[PDB]
Amino acid sequence: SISAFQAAYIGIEVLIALVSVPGNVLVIWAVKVNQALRDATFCFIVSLAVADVAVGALVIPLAILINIGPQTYFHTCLMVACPVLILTQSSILALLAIAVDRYLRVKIPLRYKMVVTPRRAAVAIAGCWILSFVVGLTPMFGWNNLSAVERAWAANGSMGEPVIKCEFEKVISMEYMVYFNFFVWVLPPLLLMVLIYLEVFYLIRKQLNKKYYGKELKIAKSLALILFLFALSWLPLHILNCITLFCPSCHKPSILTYIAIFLTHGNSAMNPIVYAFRIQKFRVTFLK
Amino acid sequence: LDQLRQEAEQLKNQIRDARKACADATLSQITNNIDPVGRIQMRTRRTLRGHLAKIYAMHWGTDSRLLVSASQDGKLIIWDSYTTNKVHAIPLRSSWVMTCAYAPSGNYVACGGLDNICSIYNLKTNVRVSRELAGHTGYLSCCRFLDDNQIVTSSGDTTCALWDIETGQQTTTFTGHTGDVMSLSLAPDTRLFVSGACDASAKLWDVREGMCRQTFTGHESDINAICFFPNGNAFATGSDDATCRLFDLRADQELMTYSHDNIICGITSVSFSKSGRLLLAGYDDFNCNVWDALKADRAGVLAGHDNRVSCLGVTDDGMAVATGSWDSFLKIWN
Amino acid sequence: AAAERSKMIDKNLREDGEKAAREVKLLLLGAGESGKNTIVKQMKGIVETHFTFKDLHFKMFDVGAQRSERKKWIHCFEGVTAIIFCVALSAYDLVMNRMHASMKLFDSICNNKWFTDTSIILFLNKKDLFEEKITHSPLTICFPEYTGANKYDEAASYIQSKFEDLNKRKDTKEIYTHFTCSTDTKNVQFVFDAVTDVIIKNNLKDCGLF
Amino acid sequence: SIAQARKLVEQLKMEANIDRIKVSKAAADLMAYCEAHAKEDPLLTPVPASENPFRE
Ligand SMILES: Nc1scc(-c2cc(C(F)(F)F)cc(C(F)(F)F)c2)c1C(=O)c1ccc(Cl)cc1
Ligand SMILES: Nc1ncnc2c1ncn2[C@@H]1O[C@H](CO)[C@@H](O)[C@H]1O
């Protein structure tokens, strides 16, 4: 039995899915039909597109399945909820990898392609995906609400495995989502991207001061738009998780949580239009 | 200077009347009755990967298995096309190559370009330069082996030359073109060759007498490519005016034009299949078009490259065509 | 085996092909008596000059020897990092004019099909010989429409403005104009600085920032 | 310019005296070659997989 705002949330989520799966598969298709896009930067961008097409196709239906909340065994609900964390963390670490790649293109520009080879780009992509799998499988490594819900299952008087209404706050402990997901693997990626793009803009503006103000303002608008999309997507949901853990006698509506959830998932809709669509090689591949 | 040009003009008018005189029909109406070849859908059977810059030339060996390729990465690669194995990778002293050739014996390759040098490489010694044929004053645009001992060359200096490789001398020179010579093609019996130039003319040369027997005009712009019909009695040209034309030696005139209104790009390379029925041509529009050489309708398209087709060739046994491209790959089709 | 020979040869291809991909290739184009020769003395058919400056390998190809039409071999240099163009300032009166032929040459290479995205390094030469020859004759012999005081500074900046504004691709390529100096260090240094600016802007265009 | 022009005249002089055949005969000879070799042309009349060396 869905609510009134619950139906609007599922509608915005499937709208986000129908924007995020064709746009990201266009980026992957344009990489495959072109040979000049075999560089290191385009490996990072197709890694972001793989992570975001997995978000648009496998995190949207799992999030709607969690939000509807069917009566479900506990470990079945963990195996539903953990691919959400796996693939969304893959999105964040891919964004940090593109920022480090853009930082190396401006910092060491002459010896860039003898430092960042597609072999080293491939092990960096594998490192980001292995780290995202480690983070998302932590709530199946024994950090989960299972102890609290089994004590309530024993206090209820039922015997055996606890079967619950499968929601995200019921199987994933908020100590994981605040102390380990946000404060380690979401907020230091956001702070590193802010520091890197400040230094990228300083090095760009130092080279362009060696007709130029318009290009410098366009670069600053492009960098600030990228940082604003990451912050608007990932900070509202995690501020609400920090509110839930730190003030428990502290009320917030459920429509506010639904709004924050699809912001997190709609990061992956706006990724092919601010990362790959800004490249001129991608645009002349799109129209052909 | 006055009398000579008027006298020459009479000669031009007389040849035109003579050429028309024996034009009792056109190839198209003679060949209207035969069955059309129909659509040909050649698939890529191999993609030869390993060049790291534009490919400008290739040539099949006479064993129909080995082929040599020349690229602006400074490498001459010999491929075993059956296995995709690289047999040799020859490091070039100058990377600005425009042509390569495989000797019919399999013992030698040749290569050259903007260095104005035709370098001969002995494959049966690693492979080392055995001769650098010097003497052209413009870029080397084409070269073809009569045998291991002798190699005919074409050059941007408007001349062609026959070289004795052992002694290193131009033994016969071929002058008379008034523009850059871009391509040449050896007759099957190797006694004649034809050349194509940027004066929009083709010229038939007799190797041992050393002069031009016949000259074929008709194209509206540069001839980038030329290839003999397999019986040695005709040849085809490819031009920047987006047309191919078939020229007959004994009738001393054009027989057929191969073009489509929706084809506006230049032609870089042409070759006939073994029976002569198919004329395959490489185009600036990234595609290869396969023409029915007898009826001039397009029979098929080979669309597998991301940049200009710069070279192609059909095996001596007719089993395959290779295409080479500026996008750094070679593909084998049949 | 044959696949062992194929893999050893393929290893040498990737090794030597990236070793020759960290080297800046600079096409050198100029007119006759335009000062191409002086530049190659400073920094050290087709002649290729190789020099290493500040751990950067530069390959400079002087293709002026070829007398053949450019349209048949200019596509071999489509991948050059930049084009070094040498202009003789003193040759604005010499011989249909030499500077007008050099401007027509410049406006052909700049607005080529292959050079749309490749920046052009512009070198103006003989500025010392230009200083005496600007008093014996005005620039009205070269440019009739010129209306300026007969001093080196304004006239040089006017000839530089004439050479620059022939760039129809104002968005995609940049012309870097340097008057050649007697100091050997300075001329090579400008080339390194111009190439670095080209490499940085090429890196920025692959991000999507530029 | 005169010396080059005289050289051109001799070439055409040679070319003017040659024997030419009629296009009707010329075109027939080319068609006869194509028909006689049609079965030995693997690109015209494709061969079975096993016979084809590249993809058996
Ligand atoms: N993560 C971020 S950062 C900016 C937006 C955004 C918001 C809106 C909104 F209507 F909610 F205000 C609209 C759009 C736009 F793309 F439609 F313009 C983007 C989002 C999304 O979550 C998002 C929401 C819906 C869609 Cl389909 C695509 C993305
Ligand atoms: N409080 C929450 N309620 C529901 N889902 C949440 C919550 N916090 C995080 N998530 C999930 O975590 C993902 C990001 O790690 C989101 O896409 C969302 O599905």
PDB file of N, CA and C in Angstrom, chain B residues 97-124:
ATOM      1  N   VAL B  97      56.650   8.254 -45.681  1.00  0.00           N
ATOM      2  CA  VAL B  97      56.545   7.325 -46.792  1.00  0.00           C
ATOM      3  C   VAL B  97      55.205   7.518 -47.478  1.00  0.00           C
ATOM      4  N   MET B  98      55.185   7.243 -48.776  1.00  0.00           N
ATOM      5  CA  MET B  98      53.971   7.314 -49.567  1.00  0.00           C
ATOM      6  C   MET B  98      53.698   6.050 -50.357  1.00  0.00           C
ATOM      7  N   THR B  99      54.668   5.151 -50.486  1.00  0.00           N
ATOM      8  CA  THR B  99      54.507   3.976 -51.323  1.00  0.00           C
ATOM      9  C   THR B  99      55.309   2.822 -50.746  1.00  0.00           C
ATOM     10  N   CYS B 100      54.851   1.608 -51.037  1.00  0.00           N
ATOM     11  CA  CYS B 100      55.634   0.412 -50.783  1.00  0.00           C
ATOM     12  C   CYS B 100      55.307  -0.631 -51.836  1.00  0.00           C
ATOM     13  N   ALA B 101      56.180  -1.628 -51.945  1.00  0.00           N
ATOM     14  CA  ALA B 101      56.008  -2.684 -52.926  1.00  0.00           C
ATOM     15  C   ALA B 101      56.637  -3.955 -52.388  1.00  0.00           C
ATOM     16  N   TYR B 102      56.046  -5.088 -52.744  1.00  0.00           N
ATOM     17  CA  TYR B 102      56.572  -6.401 -52.407  1.00  0.00           C
ATOM     18  C   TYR B 102      57.119  -7.004 -53.692  1.00  0.00           C
ATOM     19  N   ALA B 103      58.378  -7.429 -53.676  1.00  0.00           N
ATOM     20  CA  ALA B 103      58.953  -8.088 -54.844  1.00  0.00           C
ATOM     21  C   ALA B 103      58.264  -9.424 -55.108  1.00  0.00           C
ATOM     22  N   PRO B 104      58.035  -9.778 -56.382  1.00  0.00           N
ATOM     23  CA  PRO B 104      57.376 -11.059 -56.702  1.00  0.00           C
ATOM     24  C   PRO B 104      58.112 -12.287 -56.198  1.00  0.00           C
ATOM     25  N   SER B 105      59.436 -12.213 -56.051  1.00  0.00           N
ATOM     26  CA  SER B 105      60.193 -13.326 -55.496  1.00  0.00           C
ATOM     27  C   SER B 105      59.944 -13.507 -54.006  1.00  0.00           C
ATOM     28  N   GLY B 106      59.424 -12.485 -53.330  1.00  0.00           N
ATOM     29  CA  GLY B 106      59.360 -12.454 -51.887  1.00  0.00           C
ATOM     30  C   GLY B 106      60.653 -12.096 -51.195  1.00  0.00           C
ATOM     31  N   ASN B 107      61.719 -11.827 -51.946  1.00  0.00           N
ATOM     32  CA  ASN B 107      63.031 -11.576 -51.372  1.00  0.00           C
ATOM     33  C   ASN B 107      63.242 -10.129 -50.955  1.00  0.00           C
ATOM     34  N   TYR B 108      62.426  -9.200 -51.444  1.00  0.00           N
ATOM     35  CA  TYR B 108      62.693  -7.785 -51.250  1.00  0.00           C
ATOM     36  C   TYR B 108      61.393  -7.038 -51.026  1.00  0.00           C
ATOM     37  N   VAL B 109      61.483  -5.947 -50.275  1.00  0.00           N
ATOM     38  CA  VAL B 109      60.458  -4.920 -50.287  1.00  0.00           C
ATOM     39  C   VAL B 109      61.122  -3.609 -50.673  1.00  0.00           C
ATOM     40  N   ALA B 110      60.296  -2.649 -51.052  1.00  0.00           N
ATOM     41  CA  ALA B 110      60.742  -1.310 -51.386  1.00  0.00           C
ATOM     42  C   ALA B 110      59.823  -0.329 -50.695  1.00  0.00           C
ATOM     43  N   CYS B 111      60.338   0.865 -50.434  1.00  0.00           N
ATOM     44  CA  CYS B 111      59.557   1.863 -49.727  1.00  0.00           C
ATOM     45  C   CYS B 111      60.191   3.220 -49.977  1.00  0.00           C
ATOM     46  N   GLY B 112      59.362   4.254 -50.004  1.00  0.00           N
ATOM     47  CA  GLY B 112      59.884   5.598 -50.154  1.00  0.00           C
ATOM     48  C   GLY B 112      58.767   6.613 -50.123  1.00  0.00           C
ATOM     49  N   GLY B 113      59.157   7.877 -50.234  1.00  0.00           N
ATOM     50  CA  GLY B 113      58.212   8.955 -50.051  1.00  0.00           C
ATOM     51  C   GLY B 113      58.826  10.330 -50.180  1.00  0.00           C
ATOM     52  N   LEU B 114      58.581  11.192 -49.191  1.00  0.00           N
ATOM     53  CA  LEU B 114      59.062  12.568 -49.222  1.00  0.00           C
ATOM     54  C   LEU B 114      60.567  12.711 -49.037  1.00  0.00           C
ATOM     55  N   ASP B 115      61.295  11.636 -48.745  1.00  0.00           N
ATOM     56  CA  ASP B 115      62.750  11.695 -48.762  1.00  0.00           C
ATOM     57  C   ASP B 115      63.352  11.651 -50.161  1.00  0.00           C
ATOM     58  N   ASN B 116      62.525  11.452 -51.195  1.00  0.00           N
ATOM     59  CA  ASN B 116      62.900  11.337 -52.610  1.00  0.00           C
ATOM     60  C   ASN B 116      63.780  10.121 -52.881  1.00  0.00           C
ATOM     61  N   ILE B 117      63.714   9.108 -52.021  1.00  0.00           N
ATOM     62  CA  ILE B 117      64.588   7.944 -52.079  1.00  0.00           C
ATOM     63  C   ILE B 117      63.710   6.703 -52.157  1.00  0.00           C
ATOM     64  N   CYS B 118      64.073   5.760 -53.029  1.00  0.00           N
ATOM     65  CA  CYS B 118      63.477   4.428 -53.040  1.00  0.00           C
ATOM     66  C   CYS B 118      64.443   3.460 -52.369  1.00  0.00           C
ATOM     67  N   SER B 119      64.118   3.038 -51.150  1.00  0.00           N
ATOM     68  CA  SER B 119      64.982   2.151 -50.384  1.00  0.00           C
ATOM     69  C   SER B 119      64.566   0.701 -50.591  1.00  0.00           C
ATOM     70  N   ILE B 120      65.537  -0.165 -50.871  1.00  0.00           N
ATOM     71  CA  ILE B 120      65.298  -1.588 -51.098  1.00  0.00           C
ATOM     72  C   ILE B 120      65.770  -2.347 -49.868  1.00  0.00           C
ATOM     73  N   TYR B 121      64.941  -3.264 -49.376  1.00  0.00           N
ATOM     74  CA  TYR B 121      65.216  -3.992 -48.145  1.00  0.00           C
ATOM     75  C   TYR B 121      65.241  -5.478 -48.454  1.00  0.00           C
ATOM     76  N   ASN B 122      66.334  -6.146 -48.104  1.00  0.00           N
ATOM     77  CA  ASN B 122      66.487  -7.572 -48.360  1.00  0.00           C
ATOM     78  C   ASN B 122      65.854  -8.323 -47.196  1.00  0.00           C
ATOM     79  N   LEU B 123      64.855  -9.149 -47.495  1.00  0.00           N
ATOM     80  CA  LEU B 123      64.149  -9.889 -46.459  1.00  0.00           C
ATOM     81  C   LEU B 123      64.812 -11.210 -46.098  1.00  0.00           C
ATOM     82  N   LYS B 124      65.840 -11.629 -46.836  1.00  0.00           N
ATOM     83  CA  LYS B 124      66.419 -12.955 -46.657  1.00  0.00           C
ATOM     84  C   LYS B 124      67.915 -12.858 -46.384  1.00  0.00           C
TER      85      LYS B 124
END
